Every structure is written in C-alpha cells, then in structure tokens.
Short mmCIF file of C-alpha atoms in Angstrom, two decimals:
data_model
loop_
_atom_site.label_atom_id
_atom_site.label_comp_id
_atom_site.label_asym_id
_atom_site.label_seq_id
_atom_site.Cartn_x
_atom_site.Cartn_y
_atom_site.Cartn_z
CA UNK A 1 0.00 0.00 0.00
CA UNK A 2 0.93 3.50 -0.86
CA UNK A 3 0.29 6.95 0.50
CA UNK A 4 -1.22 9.12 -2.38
CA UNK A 5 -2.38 11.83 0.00
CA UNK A 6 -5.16 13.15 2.37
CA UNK A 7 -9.08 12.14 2.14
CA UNK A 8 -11.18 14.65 1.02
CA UNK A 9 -12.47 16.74 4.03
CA UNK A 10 -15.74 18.07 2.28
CA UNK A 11 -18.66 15.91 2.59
CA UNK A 12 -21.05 16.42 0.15
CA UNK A 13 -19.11 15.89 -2.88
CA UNK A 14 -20.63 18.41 -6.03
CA UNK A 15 -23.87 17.73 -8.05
CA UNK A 16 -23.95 16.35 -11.78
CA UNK A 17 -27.12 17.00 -14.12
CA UNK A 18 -27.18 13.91 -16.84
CA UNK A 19 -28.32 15.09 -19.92
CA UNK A 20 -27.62 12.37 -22.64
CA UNK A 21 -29.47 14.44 -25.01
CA UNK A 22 -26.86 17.70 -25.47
CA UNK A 23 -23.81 14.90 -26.28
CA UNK A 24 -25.47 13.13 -28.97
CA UNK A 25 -24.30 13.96 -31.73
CA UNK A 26 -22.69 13.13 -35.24
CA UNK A 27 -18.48 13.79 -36.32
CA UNK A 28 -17.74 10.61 -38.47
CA UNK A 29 -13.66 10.59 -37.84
CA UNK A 30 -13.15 7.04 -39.55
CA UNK A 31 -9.92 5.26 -39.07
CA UNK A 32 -8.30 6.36 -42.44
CA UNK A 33 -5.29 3.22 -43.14
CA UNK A 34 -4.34 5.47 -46.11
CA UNK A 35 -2.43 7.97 -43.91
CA UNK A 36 -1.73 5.52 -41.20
CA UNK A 37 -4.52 5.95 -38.10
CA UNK A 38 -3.84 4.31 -34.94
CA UNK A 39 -0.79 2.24 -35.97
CA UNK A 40 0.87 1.02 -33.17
CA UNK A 41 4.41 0.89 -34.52
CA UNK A 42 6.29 -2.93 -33.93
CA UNK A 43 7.51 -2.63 -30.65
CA UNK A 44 11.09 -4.30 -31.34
CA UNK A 45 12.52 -2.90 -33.78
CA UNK A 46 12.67 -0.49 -36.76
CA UNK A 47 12.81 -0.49 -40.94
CA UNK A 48 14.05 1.89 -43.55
CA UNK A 49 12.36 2.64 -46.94
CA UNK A 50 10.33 -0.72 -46.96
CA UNK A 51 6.93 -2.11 -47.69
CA UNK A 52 6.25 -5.60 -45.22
CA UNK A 53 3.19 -7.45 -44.28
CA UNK A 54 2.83 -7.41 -40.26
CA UNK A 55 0.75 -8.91 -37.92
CA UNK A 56 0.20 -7.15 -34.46
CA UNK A 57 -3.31 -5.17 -33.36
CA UNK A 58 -4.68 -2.63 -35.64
CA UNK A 59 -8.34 -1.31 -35.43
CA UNK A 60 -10.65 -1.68 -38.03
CA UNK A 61 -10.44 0.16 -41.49
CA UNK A 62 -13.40 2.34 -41.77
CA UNK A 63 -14.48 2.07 -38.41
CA UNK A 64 -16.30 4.93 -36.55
CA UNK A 65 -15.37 3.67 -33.14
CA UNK A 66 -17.62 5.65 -30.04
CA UNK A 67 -17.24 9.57 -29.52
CA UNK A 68 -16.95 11.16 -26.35
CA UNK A 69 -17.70 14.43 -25.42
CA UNK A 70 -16.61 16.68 -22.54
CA UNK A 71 -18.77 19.99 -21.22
CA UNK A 72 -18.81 22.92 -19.06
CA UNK A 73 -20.70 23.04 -16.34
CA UNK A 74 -24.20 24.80 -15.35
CA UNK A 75 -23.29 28.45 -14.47
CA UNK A 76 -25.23 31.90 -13.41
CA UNK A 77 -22.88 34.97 -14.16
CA UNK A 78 -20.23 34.15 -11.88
CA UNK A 79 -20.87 31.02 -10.11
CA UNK A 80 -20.62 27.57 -11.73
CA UNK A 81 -23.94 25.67 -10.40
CA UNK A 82 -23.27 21.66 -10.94
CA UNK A 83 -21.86 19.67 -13.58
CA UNK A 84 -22.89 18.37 -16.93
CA UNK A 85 -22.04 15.03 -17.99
CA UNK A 86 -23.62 12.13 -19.73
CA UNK A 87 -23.79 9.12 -18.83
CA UNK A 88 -20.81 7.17 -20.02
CA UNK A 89 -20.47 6.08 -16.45
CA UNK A 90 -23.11 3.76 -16.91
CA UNK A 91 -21.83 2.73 -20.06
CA UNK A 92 -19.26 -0.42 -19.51
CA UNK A 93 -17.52 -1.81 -22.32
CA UNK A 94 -15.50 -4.58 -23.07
CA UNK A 95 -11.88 -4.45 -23.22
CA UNK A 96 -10.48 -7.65 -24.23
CA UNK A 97 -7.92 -6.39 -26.86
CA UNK A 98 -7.13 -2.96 -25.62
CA UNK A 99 -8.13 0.06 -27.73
CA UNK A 100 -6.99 3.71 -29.42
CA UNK A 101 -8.00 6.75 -29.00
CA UNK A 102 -7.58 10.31 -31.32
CA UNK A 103 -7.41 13.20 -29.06
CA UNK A 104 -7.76 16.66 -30.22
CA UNK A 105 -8.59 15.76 -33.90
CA UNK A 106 -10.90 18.58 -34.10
CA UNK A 107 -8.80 21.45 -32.85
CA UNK A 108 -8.45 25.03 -34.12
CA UNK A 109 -11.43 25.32 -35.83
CA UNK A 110 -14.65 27.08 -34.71
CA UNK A 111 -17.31 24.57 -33.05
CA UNK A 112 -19.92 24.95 -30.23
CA UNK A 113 -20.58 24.64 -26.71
CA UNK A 114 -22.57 21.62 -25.52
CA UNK A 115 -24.96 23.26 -22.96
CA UNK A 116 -25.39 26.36 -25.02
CA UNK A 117 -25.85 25.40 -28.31
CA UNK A 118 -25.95 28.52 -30.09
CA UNK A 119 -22.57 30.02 -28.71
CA UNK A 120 -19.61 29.57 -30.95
CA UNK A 121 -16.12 28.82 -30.12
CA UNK A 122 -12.83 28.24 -30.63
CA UNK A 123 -12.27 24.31 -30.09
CA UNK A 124 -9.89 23.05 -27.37
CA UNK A 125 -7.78 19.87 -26.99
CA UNK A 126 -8.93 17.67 -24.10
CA UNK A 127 -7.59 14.60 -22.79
CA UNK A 128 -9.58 11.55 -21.67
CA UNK A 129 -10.44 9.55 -18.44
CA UNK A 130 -10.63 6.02 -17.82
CA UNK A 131 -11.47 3.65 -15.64
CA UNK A 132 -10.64 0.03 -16.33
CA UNK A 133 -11.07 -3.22 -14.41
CA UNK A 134 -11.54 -6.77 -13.74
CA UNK A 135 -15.46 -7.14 -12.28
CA UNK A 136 -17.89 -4.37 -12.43
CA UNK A 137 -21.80 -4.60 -10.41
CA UNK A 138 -24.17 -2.44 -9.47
CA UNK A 139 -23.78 0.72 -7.27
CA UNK A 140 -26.11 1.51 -4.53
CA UNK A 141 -29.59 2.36 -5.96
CA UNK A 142 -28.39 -0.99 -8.28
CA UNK A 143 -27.09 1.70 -10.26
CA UNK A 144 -24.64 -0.39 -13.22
CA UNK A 145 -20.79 0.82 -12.99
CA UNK A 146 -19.00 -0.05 -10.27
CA UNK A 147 -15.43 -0.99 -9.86
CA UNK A 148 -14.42 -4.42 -7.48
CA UNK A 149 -11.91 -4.77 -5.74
CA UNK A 150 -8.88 -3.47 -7.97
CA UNK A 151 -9.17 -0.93 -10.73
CA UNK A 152 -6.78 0.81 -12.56
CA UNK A 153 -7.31 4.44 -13.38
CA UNK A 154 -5.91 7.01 -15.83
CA UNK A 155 -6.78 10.63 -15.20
CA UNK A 156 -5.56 13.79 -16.38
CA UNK A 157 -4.68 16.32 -13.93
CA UNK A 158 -3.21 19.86 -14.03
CA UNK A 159 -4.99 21.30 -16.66
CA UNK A 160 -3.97 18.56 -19.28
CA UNK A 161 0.10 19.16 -17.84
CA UNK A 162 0.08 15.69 -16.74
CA UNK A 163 -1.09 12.04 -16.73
CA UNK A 164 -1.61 9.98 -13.47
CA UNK A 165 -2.06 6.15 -13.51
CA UNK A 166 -3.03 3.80 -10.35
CA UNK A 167 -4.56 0.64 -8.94
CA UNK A 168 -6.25 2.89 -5.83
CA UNK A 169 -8.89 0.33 -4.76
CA UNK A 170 -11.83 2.63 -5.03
CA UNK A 171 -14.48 3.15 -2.09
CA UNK A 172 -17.54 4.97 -2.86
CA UNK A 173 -17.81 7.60 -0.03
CA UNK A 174 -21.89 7.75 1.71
CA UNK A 175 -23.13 11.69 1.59
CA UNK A 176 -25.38 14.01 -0.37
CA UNK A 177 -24.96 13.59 -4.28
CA UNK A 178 -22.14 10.51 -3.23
CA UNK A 179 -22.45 7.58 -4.82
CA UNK A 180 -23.03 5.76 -1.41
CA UNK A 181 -25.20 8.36 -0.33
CA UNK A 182 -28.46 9.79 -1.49
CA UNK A 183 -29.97 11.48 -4.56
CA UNK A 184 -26.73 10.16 -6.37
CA UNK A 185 -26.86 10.27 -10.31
CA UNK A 186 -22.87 9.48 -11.55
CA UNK A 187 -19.62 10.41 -10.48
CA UNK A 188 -17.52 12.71 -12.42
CA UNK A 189 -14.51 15.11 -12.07
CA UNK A 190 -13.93 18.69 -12.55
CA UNK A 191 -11.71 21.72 -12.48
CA UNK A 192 -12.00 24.94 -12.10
CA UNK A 193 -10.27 27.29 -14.49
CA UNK A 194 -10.75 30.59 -13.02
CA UNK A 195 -8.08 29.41 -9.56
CA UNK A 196 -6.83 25.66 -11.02
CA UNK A 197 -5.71 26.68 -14.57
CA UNK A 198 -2.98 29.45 -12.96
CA UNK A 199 -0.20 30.71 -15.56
CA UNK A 200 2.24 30.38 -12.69
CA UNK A 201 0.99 27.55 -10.88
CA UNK A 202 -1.37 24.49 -12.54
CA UNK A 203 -3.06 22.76 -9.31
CA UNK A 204 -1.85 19.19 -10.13
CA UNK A 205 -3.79 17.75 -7.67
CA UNK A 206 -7.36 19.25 -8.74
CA UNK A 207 -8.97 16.32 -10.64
CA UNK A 208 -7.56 14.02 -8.03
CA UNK A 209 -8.95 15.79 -5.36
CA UNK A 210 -12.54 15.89 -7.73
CA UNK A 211 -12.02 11.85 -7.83
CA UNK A 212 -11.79 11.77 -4.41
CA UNK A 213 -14.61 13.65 -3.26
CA UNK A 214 -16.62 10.22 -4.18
CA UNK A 215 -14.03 7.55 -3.60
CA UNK A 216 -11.47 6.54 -0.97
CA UNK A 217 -8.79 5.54 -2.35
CA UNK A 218 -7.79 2.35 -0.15
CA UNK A 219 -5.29 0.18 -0.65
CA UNK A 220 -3.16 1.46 -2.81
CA UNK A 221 -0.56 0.83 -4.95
CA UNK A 222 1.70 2.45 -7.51
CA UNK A 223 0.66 5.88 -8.37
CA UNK A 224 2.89 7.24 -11.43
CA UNK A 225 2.88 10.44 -13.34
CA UNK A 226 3.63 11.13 -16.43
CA UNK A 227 4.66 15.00 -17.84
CA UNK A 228 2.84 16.57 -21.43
CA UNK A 229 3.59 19.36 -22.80
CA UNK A 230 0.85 21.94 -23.85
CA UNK A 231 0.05 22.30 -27.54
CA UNK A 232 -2.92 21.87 -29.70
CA UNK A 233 -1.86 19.01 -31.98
CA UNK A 234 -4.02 15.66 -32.99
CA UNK A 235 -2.42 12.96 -30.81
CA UNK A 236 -3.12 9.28 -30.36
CA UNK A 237 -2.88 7.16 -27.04
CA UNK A 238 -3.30 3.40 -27.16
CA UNK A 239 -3.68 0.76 -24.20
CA UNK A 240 -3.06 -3.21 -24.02
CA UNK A 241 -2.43 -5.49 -21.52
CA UNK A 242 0.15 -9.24 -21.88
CA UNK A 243 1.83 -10.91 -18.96
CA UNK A 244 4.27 -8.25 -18.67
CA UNK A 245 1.23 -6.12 -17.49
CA UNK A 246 -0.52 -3.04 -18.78
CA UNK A 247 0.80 -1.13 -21.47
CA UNK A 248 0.53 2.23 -22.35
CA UNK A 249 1.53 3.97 -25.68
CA UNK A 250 0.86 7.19 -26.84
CA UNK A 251 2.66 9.51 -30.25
CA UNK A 252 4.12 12.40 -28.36
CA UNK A 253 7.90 11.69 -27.24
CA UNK A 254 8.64 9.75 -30.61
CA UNK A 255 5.93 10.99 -33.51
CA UNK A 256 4.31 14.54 -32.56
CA UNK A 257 4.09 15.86 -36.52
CA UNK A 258 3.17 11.82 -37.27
CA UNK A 259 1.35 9.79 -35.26
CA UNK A 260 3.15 6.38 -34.65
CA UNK A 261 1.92 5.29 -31.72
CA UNK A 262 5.27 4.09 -29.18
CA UNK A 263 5.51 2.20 -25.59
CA UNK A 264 5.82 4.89 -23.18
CA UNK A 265 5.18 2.92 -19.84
CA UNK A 266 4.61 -0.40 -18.25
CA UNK A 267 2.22 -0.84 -15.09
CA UNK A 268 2.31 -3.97 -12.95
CA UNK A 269 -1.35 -4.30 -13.37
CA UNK A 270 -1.21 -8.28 -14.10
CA UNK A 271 -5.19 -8.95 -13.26
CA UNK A 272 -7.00 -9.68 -17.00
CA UNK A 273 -8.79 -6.20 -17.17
CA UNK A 274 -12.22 -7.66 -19.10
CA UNK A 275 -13.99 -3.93 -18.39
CA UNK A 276 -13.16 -0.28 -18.69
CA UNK A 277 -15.35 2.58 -19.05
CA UNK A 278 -14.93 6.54 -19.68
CA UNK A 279 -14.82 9.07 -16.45
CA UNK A 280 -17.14 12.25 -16.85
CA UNK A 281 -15.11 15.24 -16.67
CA UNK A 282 -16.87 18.48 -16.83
CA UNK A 283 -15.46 22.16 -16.31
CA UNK A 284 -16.69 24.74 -13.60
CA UNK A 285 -15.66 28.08 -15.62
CA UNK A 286 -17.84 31.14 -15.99
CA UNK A 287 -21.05 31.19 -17.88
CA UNK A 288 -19.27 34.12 -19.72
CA UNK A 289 -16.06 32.47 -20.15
CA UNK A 290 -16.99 28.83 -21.64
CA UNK A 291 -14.85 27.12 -24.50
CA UNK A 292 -15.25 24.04 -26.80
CA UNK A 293 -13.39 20.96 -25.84
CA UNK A 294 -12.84 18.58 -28.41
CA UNK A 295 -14.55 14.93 -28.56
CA UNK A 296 -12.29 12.43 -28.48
CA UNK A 297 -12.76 8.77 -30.59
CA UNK A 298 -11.96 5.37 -28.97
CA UNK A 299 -11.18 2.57 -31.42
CA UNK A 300 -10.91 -1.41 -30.59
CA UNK A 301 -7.84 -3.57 -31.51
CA UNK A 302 -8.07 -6.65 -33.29
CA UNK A 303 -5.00 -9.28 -34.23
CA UNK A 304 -5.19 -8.66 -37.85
CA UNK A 305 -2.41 -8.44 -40.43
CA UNK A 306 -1.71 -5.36 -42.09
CA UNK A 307 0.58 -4.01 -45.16
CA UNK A 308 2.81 -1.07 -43.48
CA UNK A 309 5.13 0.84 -45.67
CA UNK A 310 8.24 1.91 -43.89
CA UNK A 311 10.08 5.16 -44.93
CA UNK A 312 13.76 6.47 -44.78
CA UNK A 313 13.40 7.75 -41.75
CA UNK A 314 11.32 5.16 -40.38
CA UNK A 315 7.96 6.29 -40.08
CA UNK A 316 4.67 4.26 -41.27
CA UNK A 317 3.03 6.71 -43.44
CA UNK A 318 0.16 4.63 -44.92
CA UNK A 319 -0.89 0.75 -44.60
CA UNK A 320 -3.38 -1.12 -46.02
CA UNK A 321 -5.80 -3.37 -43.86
CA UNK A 322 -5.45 -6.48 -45.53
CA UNK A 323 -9.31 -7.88 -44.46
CA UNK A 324 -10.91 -4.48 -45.39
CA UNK A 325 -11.99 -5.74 -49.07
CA UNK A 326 -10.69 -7.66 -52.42
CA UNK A 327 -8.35 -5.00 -53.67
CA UNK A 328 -6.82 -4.69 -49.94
CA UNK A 329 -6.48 -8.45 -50.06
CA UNK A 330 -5.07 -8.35 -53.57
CA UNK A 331 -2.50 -5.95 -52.52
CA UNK A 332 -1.59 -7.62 -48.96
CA UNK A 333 -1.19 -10.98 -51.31
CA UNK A 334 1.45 -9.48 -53.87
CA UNK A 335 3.06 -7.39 -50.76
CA UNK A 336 2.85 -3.85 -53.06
CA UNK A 337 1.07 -0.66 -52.95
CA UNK A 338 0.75 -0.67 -57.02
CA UNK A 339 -1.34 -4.19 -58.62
CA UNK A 340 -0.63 -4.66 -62.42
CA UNK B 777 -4.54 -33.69 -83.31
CA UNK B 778 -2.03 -31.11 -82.08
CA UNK B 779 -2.88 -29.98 -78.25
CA UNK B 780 -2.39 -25.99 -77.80
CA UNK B 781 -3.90 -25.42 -74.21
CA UNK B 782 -5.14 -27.01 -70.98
CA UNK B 783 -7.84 -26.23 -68.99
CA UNK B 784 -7.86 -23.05 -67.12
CA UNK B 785 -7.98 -23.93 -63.48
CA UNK B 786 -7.89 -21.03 -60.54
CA UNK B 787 -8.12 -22.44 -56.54
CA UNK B 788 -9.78 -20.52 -53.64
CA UNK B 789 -6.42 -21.65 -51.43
CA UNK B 790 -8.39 -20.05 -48.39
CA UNK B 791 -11.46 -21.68 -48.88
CA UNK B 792 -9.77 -25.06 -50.04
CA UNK B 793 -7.75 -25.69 -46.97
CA UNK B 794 -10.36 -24.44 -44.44
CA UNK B 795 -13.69 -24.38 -46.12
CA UNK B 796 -15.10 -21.82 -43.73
CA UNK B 797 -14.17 -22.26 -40.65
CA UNK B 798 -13.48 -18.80 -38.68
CA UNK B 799 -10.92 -21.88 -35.92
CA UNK B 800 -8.82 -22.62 -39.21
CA UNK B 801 -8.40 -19.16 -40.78
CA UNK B 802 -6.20 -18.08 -37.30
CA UNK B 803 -4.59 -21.37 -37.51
CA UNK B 804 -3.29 -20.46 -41.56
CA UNK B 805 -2.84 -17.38 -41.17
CA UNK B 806 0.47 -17.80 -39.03
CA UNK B 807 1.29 -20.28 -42.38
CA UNK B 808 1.65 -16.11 -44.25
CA UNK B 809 2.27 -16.43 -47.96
CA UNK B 810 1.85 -19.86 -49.08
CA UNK B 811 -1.67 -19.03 -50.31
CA UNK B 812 -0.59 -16.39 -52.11
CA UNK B 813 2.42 -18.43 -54.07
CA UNK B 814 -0.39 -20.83 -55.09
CA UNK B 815 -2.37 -18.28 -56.24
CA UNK B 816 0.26 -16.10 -58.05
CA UNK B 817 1.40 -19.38 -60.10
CA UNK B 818 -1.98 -20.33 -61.27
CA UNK B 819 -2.64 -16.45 -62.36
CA UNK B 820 0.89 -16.45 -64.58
CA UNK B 821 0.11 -19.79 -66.16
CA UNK B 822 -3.44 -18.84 -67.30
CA UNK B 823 -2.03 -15.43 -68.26
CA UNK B 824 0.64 -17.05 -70.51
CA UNK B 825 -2.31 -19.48 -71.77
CA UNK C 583 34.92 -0.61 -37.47
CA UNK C 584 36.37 -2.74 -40.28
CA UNK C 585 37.18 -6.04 -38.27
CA UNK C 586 34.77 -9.03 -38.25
CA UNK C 587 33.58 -9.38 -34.41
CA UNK C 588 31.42 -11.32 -32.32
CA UNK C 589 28.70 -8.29 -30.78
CA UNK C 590 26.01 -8.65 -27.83
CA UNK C 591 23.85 -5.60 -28.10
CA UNK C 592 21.30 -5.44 -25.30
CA UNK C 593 20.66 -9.01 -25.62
CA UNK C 594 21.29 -9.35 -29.19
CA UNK C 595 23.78 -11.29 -30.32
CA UNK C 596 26.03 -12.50 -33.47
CA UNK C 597 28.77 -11.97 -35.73
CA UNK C 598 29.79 -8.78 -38.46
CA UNK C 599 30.94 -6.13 -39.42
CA UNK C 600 30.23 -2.53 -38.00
CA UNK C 601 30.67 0.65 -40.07
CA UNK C 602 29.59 4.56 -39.97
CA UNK C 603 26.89 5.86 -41.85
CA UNK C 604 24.01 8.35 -42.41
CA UNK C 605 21.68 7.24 -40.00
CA UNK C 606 17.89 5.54 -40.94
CA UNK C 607 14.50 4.26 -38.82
CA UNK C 608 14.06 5.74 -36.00
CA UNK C 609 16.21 6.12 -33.25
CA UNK C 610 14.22 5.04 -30.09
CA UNK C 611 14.33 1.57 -31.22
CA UNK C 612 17.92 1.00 -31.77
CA UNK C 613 18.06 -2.17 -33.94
CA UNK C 614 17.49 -1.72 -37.32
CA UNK C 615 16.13 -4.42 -39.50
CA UNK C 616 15.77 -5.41 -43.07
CA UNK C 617 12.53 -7.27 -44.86
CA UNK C 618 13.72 -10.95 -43.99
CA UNK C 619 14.73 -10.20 -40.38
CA UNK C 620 18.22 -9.06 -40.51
CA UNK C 621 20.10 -6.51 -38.30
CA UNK C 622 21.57 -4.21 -40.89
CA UNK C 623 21.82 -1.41 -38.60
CA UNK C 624 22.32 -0.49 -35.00
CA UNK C 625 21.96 3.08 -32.75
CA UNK C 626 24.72 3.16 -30.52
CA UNK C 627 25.11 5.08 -26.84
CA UNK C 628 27.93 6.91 -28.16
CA UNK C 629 25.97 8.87 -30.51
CA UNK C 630 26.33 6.76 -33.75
CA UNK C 631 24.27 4.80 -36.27
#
C-alpha cells in the first residue's frame, strides 16, 4: 500500500445534471489506413524505406469507433452551479484487446458549446479519463458501474500538464450527491479554471482531489505520473495489456508531426482487465467564459495483419488493412502498394 | 490432333484448406504467404495461356 | 569498425561487421532491420548509427 495523499475533508461531494441528449451527436472521424490511423508501430525494432506485411493489433479500417464528449458546467454569471455530464459512467464496455483513442482531432477550428448550443467557439484539446477493471456490479440504488476490488485508473490532472495512472482500490464515499449516499446520479470530475488553470501555478492535484470527493482511495498501490507538454496538436494514445502487465503507448515523445503510436510505460497491473469505461469530466468556468473541448474517438484492436510501408526515416506513413476488401487483399497478397 | 492449351484452373487456397471455418483461418494465417504463391502461379500460367 | 567481431547488443547477439553511416528508422528503437529479419543497422550510446 501506498500513500497518495489526504481524504477529502468536504462531505457532500458536487452535483452532476445527466443530460444524454446535449452529447449526442454526429463527427464521423473514420480510421483512415491510407495515412496511417492508430498504428501502433512494432515494438522491437525499426525499418528503412520498406513495404512488409505485419501482424500485431490494428483497429478496423473504416471504423467509426464511439465519440466522447466533454462539457462545461451549469453556471449563473459568476458562479458555476453543478456539472454536466452524460452518462458514459453507466456505459461499460469490453476491453479484451485494448483500444486507441484520437485526441484533439478537431482542434483550431470554430465549433460549439454543448450546454449552449448557439454560442460559438474556438475548439480546445482535451484529454480523456478512464477507468478500467476486472469485475464491475451495481452501485447503490443498483445503479450499473461499479469498480471491485482493484481498478486501474488514468486521469488527467493539471490542466492537461500531466497524466496519473493507479490501482487505488476505489471506495464509494456515503453523503449528499455521493455515490453511497443519497440522490446520487454518476460520479464525475472537474476543475475549475478561473483558480486551477494558474499561468504560474497548474493545481496538479485538482482532478484528483474531484475523484476523491466520491471515492477513498484504499489500498493502494503504484501511483505514477507522467509529464505533457501543452500544444494543440491531434495525438493518439493506445492501451493493451500481456503478462508483462498493462501497457501504455501514446505519439508524443517519438511521432508529434506523425502519429506512430510508441511504448511509453509499463504498469504492474497483471489482473485480466475484461472492463473499462470513460470518467465524466466536466469544467466549472464562468457562464461568460466557456470554451469548446474537443470529442475524443476510442477505437478497438483486433490481431489482424496489415501491409505497413516503412520510410527512410522510419515512419509508417500509410498501410493497407489487408481484411478491409478484395483490392486490400489483392495488394496484402502481392506485398505492393501498385497491382498490375 | 495437335494440343495448344489445358484447362484453365484457378483455386480458392483459403477456402480449399479451411472451407469456412473462422478456428482454421487463425490457424493459416500464421502459415503467411503460401496461399498467395499458389495463387500467383496459377494467375501467370493462365495469363501465358 | 572494419574487423569481423562477435557483438552482444542489449541481448542481441552475433557476428559482423560494424561501419559509420548516415543514420535511418528511427532512433528510439535501436536495432534496425531489413525485410527478412536481418540486423543491418544499430543506434549506438555513443551517438552513432
């Protein structure tokens, strides 16, 4: 067990209005093969100026995978009122490959907010939350969601500065708008940009301290952190598990103009996650100071066998998915981008 | 009688050694490019037919 | 560089020759292969592909 800090010494932890309705939406972002999506570059080795079949986990060409969406919260002038999230903490998924996800593709451009729909705005890069496991039940009012009795979490903190990754058995905490307690509708985290998001100072402990408003942290074990640096450039981030434990890979430290997806970390997390689900995240700003974060796509892995073409200086730059159709197949089979 | 061609014959090398089955497919496709040999061949002899 | 030796690079091992060149792939992942899994190139902690 390892110390990761104090318990939260507020009781009734905030108040979160689920409305489903605002966050769905349409943004097809379709894993494009033609200019390499989600490639998880071989994690041995390297090639120069090459074109070789491969077989490792790609997702799907063509596929739309699930968006997610985060919002600003309720707010009257001056005073941010509760939280607005949807209910992806209900939603539990399957794992059972690992998966991808495209952060920030929609950046720089000029998009809405979610809980005022006619308000444009500048979009934002956001990172996402998860929550991933190895048995999931009910919560109190048999509400579905609920982590047993090890789950590893990855959570953002510091105004997307840094990453934090832990085991952190998770104990719902009993009080109003808890999940233990009463009136409780999900969980979710938050930050508040007018004191946390500081030029001087970003409070790297603000979404934990959110998390733990409805959990305990118990138990714990290692509790890492990892450092980004601020930009607002498309990035991917990819996650799956062998015997070695989790791993984690992201295109930041290696490919930041690219994409290539490399092993960043390695977490002793040996149990066979089969669950995972997103974390709500929403942002107490000012009704008059609101911006547009991003939705971010999450992908599945499969054990297929791809075509990747390797440049000079070692980058996979397109691939063909060799399952997608008959040309795909015909090119996969003669090993060449060009059939006579 | 002079002979001046045989029989055009093209295999489904997939379908021929597994027939089908999703268990099989896995189990070939760690076999990589003997398919595609067979099938390569058979397209250059009907092309030079 | 020049002189056939016997190398153990992080736990790979074998026998060649070692030169200096312009460097190619990408440096993070040191060992540098070719299409029919051969080491034909190697990053090394002094600086030097």
């Amino acid at each position: 067990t390892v110390d990761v800090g104090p318990d939260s010494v507020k009781s009734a932890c905030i108040e979160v209005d689920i409305q489903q309705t605002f966050f769905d939406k349409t943004w097809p972002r379709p894993i494009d093969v033609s200019k390499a999506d989600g490639i998880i570059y071989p994690q041995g080795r390297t090639y120069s100026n090459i074109t070789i079949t491969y077989q490792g986990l790609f997702p799907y060409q063509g596929d739309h995978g699930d968006m997610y969406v985060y919002s600003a919260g309720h707010a009257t002038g001056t005073t941010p009122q509760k939280l607005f999230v949807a209910n992806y903490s209900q939603d539990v998924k399957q794992f059972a490959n690992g998966f991808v996800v495209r952060i920030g593709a929609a950046a720089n451009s000029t998009g809405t907010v979610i809980i005022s729909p006619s308000t444009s705005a500048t979009i934002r890069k956001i990172y996402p939350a998860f929550m991933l496991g190895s048995s999931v039940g009910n919560f109190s009012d048999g509400k579905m969601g609920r982590f047993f009795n090890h789950t590893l979490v990855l959570l953002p903190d510091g105004c997307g500065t840094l990453l934090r990754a832990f085991y952190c058995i998770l104990e719902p905490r009993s009080g109003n708008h808890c999940p233990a307690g009463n009136s409780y509708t999900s969980f979710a985290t938050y930050h508040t940009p007018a004191t946390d998001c500081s030029d001087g100072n970003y409070n790297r402990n603000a979404s934990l301290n959110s998390f733990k408003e409805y959990f305990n942290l118990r138990n714990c074990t290692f509790m890492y952190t990892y450092n980004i640096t601020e930009d607002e450039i498309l990035e991917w981030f990819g996650i799956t598990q062998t015997a070695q434990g989790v791993h984690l890979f992201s295109s930041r430290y290696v490919d930041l103009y690219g994409g290539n997806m490399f092993q960043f970390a390695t977490l002793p997390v040996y149990d066979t996650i089969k669950y995972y689900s997103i974390i709500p995240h929403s942002i107490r700003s000012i009704q008059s100071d609101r911006k547009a974060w991003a939705a971010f796509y999450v992908y599945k892995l499969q054990p297929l066998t791809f075509l990747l073409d390797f440049s000079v200086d070692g980058y996979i730059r397109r691939a063909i998915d060799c399952g997608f159709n008959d040309l795909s197949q015909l090119h996969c089979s003669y090993e060449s981008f060009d059939v006579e | 009688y002079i002979q001046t061609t045989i029989q055009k014959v093209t295999v489904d090398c997939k379908q021929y050694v597994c027939n089908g089955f999703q268990k099989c497919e896995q189990l070939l496709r760690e076999y990589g490019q003997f398919c595609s040999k067979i099938n390569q061949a058979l397209h250059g002899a009907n092309l030079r037919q | 560089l020049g002189n056939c030796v016997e190398y153990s690079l992080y736990g790979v091992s074998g026998r060649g020759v070692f030169q200096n060149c312009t460097a190619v792939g990408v440096r993070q992942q040191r060992f540098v292969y070719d299409a029919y899994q051969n080491l034909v190139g190697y990053y090394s902690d002094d600086g030097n592909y």
